[PDB]
């Protein structure tokens, strides 16, 4: 599992829990080219998104779709989504963990990067 | 203004008005006491707290009343309050923003100083 | 101004300088249309990005070189930039301002809207 | 496992490892007597503070020997310490993760509670 994604839910407290999350791959045209998705557990977790072999080097961009969130919650949040964007394995083979903090009008996020 | 405050609300995007601030010195003693203290205004912001003269070197704590804040609001939080204790260096023209990002479960504070 | 972008570093703390902004609106057509940008000032402020006139209802983005900061600083960041997708709602007298916090590995950023 | 502390570090991506934290308990006559302390492991996590039966309902406070940590790293930080304060098992026992992100003039807190 060399990519994580961890969602919080900053006003309940909780984990935040189906939580739809698209990872991207910059592709040879600048383009961005769908590389994996799914859905935060009950725990706010998703693993399996892919595995060592099919994580090569390149730029990644991991899409929560934190508006259908809220939306779900009945609030109105400001953001369309939030967008995590980095190079990933650029000298060598690391496990990274995209943390993820919501609240309706802000976010923050971490990543936590080990060899 | 050598110390100011900023307050801000993550759940509706719009300044914390009226919080309750206090800041306390470190004495001699190891014990708080009192050094100023006010309520945010419209703008989320708390000016004239003290003055260059009075805000000497010396270990500050600013308590934010972020409790109530979420009550007047019908949020029960978890925080009691939202607590920043720094030394002042006073190394230099130094000016110190407090600033403060509030949501129920969760907040973040950081430090300007220009 | 209908829109501000505000900066800060939370490794030095300062004022994020000299900070590309980039500024997109999303076109009839799902494509990303430059709208504005500009570089953060002294403050770590950037304003006059649009004016109420232009600034019209539709999903923004707001993209920020946060990669070219931290090189110049001599530390190797995480992300590529810092992107900031909204909806203007248009529905009243509206300011936005748009804050980011940055950290070579993290960032958080909010909105006010006043 | 009542109460767990989770540090990272926004600087480097990783935890924040050999943190030291206390923990105290408001006594009856507003005083802050000391509860637990412990340092964070090497995966910025602090486990076995307390037991169900020991923690009881009251205010704590957990302080996060932040200074410290930075100080350690060459980095002059501008916070004495971060202290989170919350009155816990107000309505029955529950789990507390209180995490905090750390950079050397910001620092994040969240709570996750459990049930
Ligand atoms: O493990 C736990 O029990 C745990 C409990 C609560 C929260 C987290 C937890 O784990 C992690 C881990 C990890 O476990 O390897 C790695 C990165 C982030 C988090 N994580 C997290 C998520 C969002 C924001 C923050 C922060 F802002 F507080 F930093 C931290």
Redesign the interface.
């Given at each position: 599992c060399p990519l994580m994604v961890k969602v919080?839910?900053?006003?309940?407290?909780?984990?935040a829990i189906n939580v739809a999350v698209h990872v991207f791959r910059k592709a040879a045209d600048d383009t961005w080219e769908p590389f994996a998705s799914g859905k935060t557990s009950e725990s706010g977790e998703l693993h399996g998104l892919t595995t060592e072999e099919q994580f090569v080097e390149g730029?990644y961009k991991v899409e929560i779709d934190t508006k259908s969130y809220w939306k779900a919650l009945g609030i109105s949040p400001?953001?369309?989504?939030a967008?995590?964007?980095?190079?990933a394995n650029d000298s060598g083979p690391r496990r990274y963990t995209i943390?993820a903090?919501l609240?309706?009008?802000?976010?923050?996020?971490?990543?936590?990067?080990?060899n």
């Open positions: 919080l839910d900053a006003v309940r407290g909780s984990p730029i400001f953001h369309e989504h967008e995590v964007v980095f190079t943390a903090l609240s309706p009008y802000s976010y923050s996020t971490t990543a936590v990067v080990t």
